[PDB]
């Protein structure tokens, strides 16, 4: 343990950095690195990795999903909330972000929050299915007037 | 008389809804609404 574990981390950690520096992008390297630090519960490091990966390629939707997911897995609700907001702000067209964002809020219990999100979403005049999901959302509660509106 | 947030003369510490009485140093950056409308999520 105390030192023996440590050396292991240097070899992995250093290797991860080498891979990234060599290829720069190829975000499977970024992601694997993030995952490893997440597994060791060094999530502050993980956050920085994800942010660095975003600097390289902010459009990559798998990256963002892995980032938000990581926060949620560690019960870091408010971090996740921030991240979701960013994702939808910079890549509004990606419907996956919206669906997950509303789902998370619903799970947390924040119906008002979810409603707010959906109202933002609808401003983009999206797709038939999105509207259906908003209506269905309302219909999981009575809220028939809202649905009709 | 109330002794709860629900309910100057009182001469009591009363905090009526949610003004914090103990240090938190909370991260959150104040949510804002502008004039009539919107939570300024931007």
């Amino acid at each position: 343990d105390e030192e023996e574990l440590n050396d292991y981390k240097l070899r992995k950690r250093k290797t991860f950095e080498d891979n990234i520096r060599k290829n720069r992008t190829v975000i499977s390297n970024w992601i694997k690195y993030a995952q490893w630090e997440e597994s060791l519960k060094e999530i502050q490091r993980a956050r920085s990795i994800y942010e660095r990966a975003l600097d390289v390629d902010y459009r990559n939707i798998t990256l963002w999903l892995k980032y938000a997911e990581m926060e949620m897995k560690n019960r870091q609700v408010n971090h996740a909330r921030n991240i979701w907001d960013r994702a939808i702000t910079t890549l509004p067209r990606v419907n996956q972000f919206w669906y997950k964002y509303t789902y998370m809020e619903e799970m947390l219990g924040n119906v008002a929050g979810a409603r707010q999100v959906f109202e933002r979403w609808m401003e983009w005049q999206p797709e038939e299915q999105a509207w259906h999901s908003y209506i269905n959302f309302e219909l999981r509660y009575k809220e028939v007037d809202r649905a009709r509106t | 008389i109330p002794r709860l947030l629900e309910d100057p003369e009182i001469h009591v510490a009363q905090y009526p809804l949610d003004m914090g009485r103990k240090k938190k140093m909370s991260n959150a950056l104040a949510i804002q609404v502008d004039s009539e409308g919107k939570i300024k999520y931007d």
């Binding site: 981390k9 950095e17 519960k41 956050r47 408010n78 971090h79 921030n82 | -």
Partner: peptide
């Protein structure tokens, strides 16, 4: 040499957003 194993190479503390990250800390291995 110590830009790795001593001190976090380059650090970006995450930006802080409408929620409380003060409380959160994480477990050892």
């Amino acid at each position: 040499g110590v830009d790795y194993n001593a001190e976090i190479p380059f650090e970006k503390k995450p930006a802080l957003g409408f929620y409380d990250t003060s409380e959160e800390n994480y477990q050892a291995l």
